[PDB]
């Protein structure tokens with residue numbers, strides 16, 4: 517009597533009906549470009565796993581971004597490369613332009629198209645209702661694509677959505693946690709930023725799917741239209757589920773748990789307490805009301821659901837009335 521299994525309700529078998537070489541990234545043989553084409557200009561940041569630099573391609577003088585991988589699992593490097601190659605050319609997917617190694621030290625690096633992303637304090641002060649609808653649509657294009665290509669991103673958050681606002685240009689980046697979906701597979705629940713973790717991760721339910729990304733997207737939407745980043749602000753993973761339950765209510769949480777026969781740490785029930793489900797209207801104020809509409813709230817309500825099987829797919833999301841004005845305007849013959 518363990519947890520009830522689950523499988524994605526869409527794109528369930530997309531990797532099943534593809535050649536082994538598509539999803540078997542361990543078998544992937546890398547063709548390396550030339551390290552000496554790129555000059556590092558400045559360090560942009562660093563994670564547990566890598567350091568990221570602004571760089572110049574000296575053959576054509578174009579800016580790029582170089583991510584140098586610290587000596588981690590060769591498996592995870594091949595996984596990320598295979599995913600990036602599989603998704604290359606997809607809508608709003610960051611373009612992997614090159615892969616290079618030091619021939620002597622054997623350290624690999626990924627080379628990406630450069631995105632001149634807008635400051636954020638600037639975006640926070642000027643994004644309109646239409647802007648948000650537009651960029652949400654563009655994110656959904658990316659997620660529907662990678663999901664249709666059998667891949668879960670698993671780290672959707674504002675920092676991984678780069679926006680060059682003056683060119684109305686968006687890219688979904690940081691595919692380092694992304695993974696192929698195979699039905700019935702149990703996955704690591706230690707993915708996504710705390711604030712963007714779905715309830716399935718927080719209750720250690722491992723047989724999750726693409727719908728994880730839709731929870732994360734809902735958190736981003738809430739953060740944007742209510743002007744509170746992050747929207748659910750827990751101080752640890754336990755507290756994160758408490759923050760969700762204070763909004764979504766504990767009754768639906770326990771129904772979720774009950775449906776999948778999930779067992780909670782006894783301490784969770786003590787700290788989860790008892791909370792009513794709130795109305796989304798509660799978070800609307802004079803300062804954010806210009807970004808909020810009935811359509812926005814209906815849409816949000818269909819993303820932020822405990823049951824992962826209940827959330828909108830990316831395709832279904834793109835069909836929502838919230839996007840009516842955007843979809844009209846993008847019907848272009850160019």
Ligand SMILES: NC(=O)c1nc(-c2ccc(C(=O)O)cc2)nc2c1[nH]c(=O)n2-c1ccccc1
Pocket residue numbers: 560561562568581583610628629630631632633678689690691692
């Ligand atoms: N194109 C850019 O402009 C660009 N691309 C990436 C990027 C990273 C990883 C991956 C990946 O691993 O898939 C893809 C793309 N990261 C960027 C970036 N511009 C930028 O300031 N950072 C950044 C900032 C702070 C901390 C870390 C990174």
